[PDB]
């Protein structure tokens with residue numbers, strides 16, 4: 001039963017650097033300090049959808065795990081709706097991959113394992129992210145990650161809010177399963193997230209994103225990320241996982257608990 005916060009609780013007289021965070025920005029809280037601000041709606045009122053929203057939030061508040069970012073609270077105000085979540089100092093996954101330094105096999109692989117525990121946890125709670133991608137992986141100072149849903153994809157009501165025409169406030173297709181490409185009617189499954197996971201493993205070892213009509217149809221046909229562009233050393237059973245998880249058949253792809261069952265043994269020994 002979620003924490004409500006107010007707009008007044010924050011300060012703008014501060015120059016925060018929300019660089020490398022994405023759509024969401026950084027906010028300074030007067031009592032508690034640095035936080036992540038997702039503004040989702042601004043404009044006219046509509047206290048007619050408030051209750052539903054709350055219920056949704058209540059439901060999503062049941063998701064609590066070390067690899068999913070925490071909601072610190074919501075701002076539900078007249079003509080203004082926001083989500084407020086924990087601060088992750090290093091920002092999203094791409095930003096850290098596209099850093100000016102470098103990151104070890106042991107780190108990258110631990111990042112992967114952490115992701116996996118996240119996703120397995122989520123599916124454990126019978127929930128489909130529907131939008132897994134490096135943008136929605138956030139990193140703390142100790143390169144421990146947390147999964148986010150910053151485009152509200154896995155939401156229903158809050159989703160419906162972030163698009164209400166009366167609002168005043170896509171590449172994401174490169175991570176989408178092909179089943180869902182040009183077919184909006186097929187119900188997403190855990191597997192859709194697994195395809196997405198695959199393309200993320202690619203993004204990680206490639207330290208960069210992947211690459212419409214032609215391309216979309218190509219991916220539907222069987223096109224995948226150019227596995228040649230990984231100039232970094234990437235293990236055989238890992239490019240094997242990548243290959244297996246972006247299979248055109250949802251039947252062919254593995255569950256996260258299975259993936260981990262086979263990967264947890266493989267991280268600790270040959271990676272950490």
Ligand SMILES: COc1ccc2c(c1)C1=NN(C(=O)CO)[C@H](c3ccc(OC(F)(F)F)c(F)c3)[C@@H]1CC2
Pocket residue numbers: 038056057058060061062063067068069070071074083085122127128129130147148149150151152154155158
């Ligand atoms: C509004 O009530 C709520 C109540 C609880 C939460 C949120 C919003 C959140 N919102 N979040 C966002 O990233 C929103 O941009 C975070 C979040 C959302 C979904 C996640 O997994 C998904 F989407 F199921 F696939 C996740 F790992 C983290 C955060 C979770 C906790």
